[PDB]
Design goal:
Catalytic activity: L-asparaginyl-[protein] + NAD(+) = N(4)-(ADP-D-ribosyl)-L-asparaginyl-[protein] + nicotinamide + H(+)
Function: ADP-ribosylates eukaryotic Rho and Rac proteins on an asparagine residue.
Shape: globular
CATH superfamily: Toxin ADP-ribosyltransferase, Chain A, domain 1
Distance between the termini: 26 Å
Family: To exoenzymes 3 of C.limosum and C.botulinum C phage, and to S.aureus ediN.
CATH topology: Toxin ADP-ribosyltransferase, Chain A, domain 1
Active site: 84, 130, 170
CATH architecture: Alpha-Beta Complex
Largest sheet: 5 strands, mixed
Bound molecules: nicotinamide-adenine-dinucleotide
Helix content: 25-40%
Number of strands: 8
Radius of gyration: 17 Å
Strand order of the largest sheet: 1-4-8-7-2
Order of helices and strands: HHHEHEEHEEEEE
Number of helices: 5
Structural class: alpha+beta
Number of domains: 1
Protein name: Mono-ADP-ribosyltransferase C3
C-alpha cells in the first residue's frame, strides 16, 4: 500500500510539511535550485559517464556532491507513489523514431519490443530521477508515464518549494537508483505506455 495523491492542494500541503523539516544548508538549497534549471544536462553527463564525476568541471562536482549529501536529510516518511513523464528515448535509441505513429498513437510492435526489453527487469539509472507527487499536466502528456512505488524511509525530497519552475510538485530521487519494472501496458486510448515500477536503493 503506497500513498497516491489525487489532489494538488493536498499534495502541496504534504510536500510543504516535509520540506520544512529538511533543514537544508544554504549550499544544498543552491545546488537543488540549480539542478531544477539544468537537470537534463546534469543527468545526461551522469549517464554519459556512468556516474563517474571525476572528469566533470569543479563546480559540477561540487553540485553533485551537494545534491547527494542533501539526501541525508530527505527521506519519505511513508510508502508513496511518484510520477514521471518520459519521451521515447527513455526506452533506448531504437525507440526514438519508432515508438509513436503519425498521430500520437503508440506503435504496437514497438510497445512489444519495449515490453520484452524492460518488463519484469531491473533498471539502473545514473542520473537523478525527477518525479512528481501527481501526474502533473506539464509531463502527463508524454508518451511514457511511470508510476514509482517508493518505500517508507527511502531517500526522496520534496524540492518544489525551491524549484525554479512552478506546478511540478517535484519529488527528487537520488542518482544511481535501481527500480524494477513490474507492469507495462498501453493506456485506454492507445496514446501512452503506462509503467508501474518498484523503487529500490542507490549506490
Ligand atoms: N519528467 C517528469 O515527470 C518531471 C517531474 C518533475 C520535475 N521535472 C523537471 O523537469 C526538468 C527535468 O526534465 P527531465 O525530467 O525531463 O530530464 P531527464 O534527465 O530525466 O530526462 C531528459 C530527457 O531524456 C530522457 N531520458 C530519461 N532517462 C533516460 C535514459 N536513462 N536514457 C536516455 N534518455 C533518457 C527523458 O525522457 C527526457 O526526454 C527539470 O526542470 C525538472 O525539475 C520533470
Amino acid at each position: 500500500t503506497y500513498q497516491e495523491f489525487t489532489n494538488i492542494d493536498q499534495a502541496k500541503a504534504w510536500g510543504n510539511a516535509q520540506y520544512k523539516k529538511y533543514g537544508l544548508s544554504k549550499s544544498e538549497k543552491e545546488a537543488i535550485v540549480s539542478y531544477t534549471k539544468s537537470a537534463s544536462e546534469i543527468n545526461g553527463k551522469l549517464r554519459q559517464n556512468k556516474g563517474v564525476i571525476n572528469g566533470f568541471p569543479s563546480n559540477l562536482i561540487k553540485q553533485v556532491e551537494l545534491l547527494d549529501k542533501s539526501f541525508n536529510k530527505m527521506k519519505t516518511p511513508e510508502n508513496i507513489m511518484l510520477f514521471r513523464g518520459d519521451d521515447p528515448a527513455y526506452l533506448g535509441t531504437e525507440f526514438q523514431n519508432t515508438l509513436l505513429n503519425s498521430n500520437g498513437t503508440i506503435n504496437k510492435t514497438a510497445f512489444e519490443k519495449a515490453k520484452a526489453k524492460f518488463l519484469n527487469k531491473d533498471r539502473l539509472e545514473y542520473g537523478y530521477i525527477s518525479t512528481s507527487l501527481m501526474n502533473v499536466s506539464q509531463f502527463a502528456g508524454r508518451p511514457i508515464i511511470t508510476k514509482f512505488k517508493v518505500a517508507k524511509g527511502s531517500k526522496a525530497g520534496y524540492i518544489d518549494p525551491i524549484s525554479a519552475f512552478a506546478g511540478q510538485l517535484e519529488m527528487l530521487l537520488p542518482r544511481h537508483s535501481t527500480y524494477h519494472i513490474d507492469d507495462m501496458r498501453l493506456s485506454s486510448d492507445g496514446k501512452q505506455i503506462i509503467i508501474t515500477a518498484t523503487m529500490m536503493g542507490t549506490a
